[PDB]
Amino acid sequence: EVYLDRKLLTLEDKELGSGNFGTVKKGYYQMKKVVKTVAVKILPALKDELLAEANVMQQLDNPYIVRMIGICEAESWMLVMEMAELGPLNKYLQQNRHVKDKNIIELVHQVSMGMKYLEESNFVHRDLAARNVLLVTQHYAKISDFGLSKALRADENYYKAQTHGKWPVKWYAPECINYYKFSSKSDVWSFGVLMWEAFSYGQKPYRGMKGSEVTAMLEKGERMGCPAGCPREMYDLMNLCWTYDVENRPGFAAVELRLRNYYYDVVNHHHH
Numbered sequence: 001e002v003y004l005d006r007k008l009l010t011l012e013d014k015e016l017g018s019g020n021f022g023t024v025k026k027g028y029y030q031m032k033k034v035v036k037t038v039a040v041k042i043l044p045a046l047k048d049e050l051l052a053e054a055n056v057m058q059q060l061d062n063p064y065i066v067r068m069i070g071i072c073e074a075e076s077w078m079l080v081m082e083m084a085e086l087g088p089l090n091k092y093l094q095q096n097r098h099v100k101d102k103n104i105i106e107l108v109h110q111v112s113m114g115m116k117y118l119e120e121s122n123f124v125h126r127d128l129a130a131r132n133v134l135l136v137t138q139h140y141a142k143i144s145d146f147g148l149s150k151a152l153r154a155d156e157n158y159y160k161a162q163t164h165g166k167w168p169v170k171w172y173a174p175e176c177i178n179y180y181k182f183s184s185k186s187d188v189w190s191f192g193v194l195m196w197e198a199f200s201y202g203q204k205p206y207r208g209m210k211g212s213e214v215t216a217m218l219e220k221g222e223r224m225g226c227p228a229g230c231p232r233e234m235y236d237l238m239n240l241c242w243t244y245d246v247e248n249r250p251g252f253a254a255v256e257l258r259l260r261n262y263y264y265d266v267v268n269h270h271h272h
């Protein structure tokens, strides 16, 4: 079905990324006729996690989401995906500080379109950060890294985690921390942090702070300040994403429309 032939896969030595799972490496898959450049995640608990990740990716079909090519069991279990040559958004902006506001708005808007689709599909990402937005080009972003993602049950709007795993706490909404509940609204909170990272050219959020100090800050009603040069309209949107009460926080339909309209305003202004 989605099981690839190891003979048709050529892996490169140099690592693109790494973690607890293992590594991400560049490869080439011999297709129908052409050769396709690919990104390959290489590795008991990890196997099931990789299969689950593959199973989520298989179900998604959207221009702003990384597509899975297939899986392969060879020297290790491998998850073969589309290649995004310019790599993680945070690293790209760290290395390309000349990138313009309009360009950043374009890219975060593309993420909002991907997340709108994910929300409509009733999946929660649970790791939406600038490190997991990949650039195909300078004007084309895709959402990646679905290893923590969950398909929501038909009768529930949230996923309830059993235990506090190794979590990216600085991206998580209050209800994730306090109740272990993850919804599309919690992904919206994470998207606010992602926006902050993007306009801060890949700077880490809540710098110098422990997780428990971020909790205290958030409970005082405090939020990260506006990044230098970030348009006021985009900071307003970040703060709306950081609405404490999950019910009053906007969904991605509302977020995507705000971004779309502001982007077209900036596109008009730059013609003027």
Ligand SMILES: Cn1cc(-c2nc(N[C@@H]3CCCC[C@@H]3N)c(F)c3c2C(=O)NC3)cn1
Pocket: 016, 017, 018, 019, 024, 039, 066, 081, 082, 083, 084, 085, 086, 087, 088, 131, 132, 134, 144, 145
């Ligand atoms: C040029 N380049 C491409 C990637 C890439 N990285 C992925 N995961 C990394 C895990 C470590 C943290 C940074 C990423 N989140 C990933 F899932 C995919 C890629 C890719 O091109 N397609 C899928 C990295 N560099």
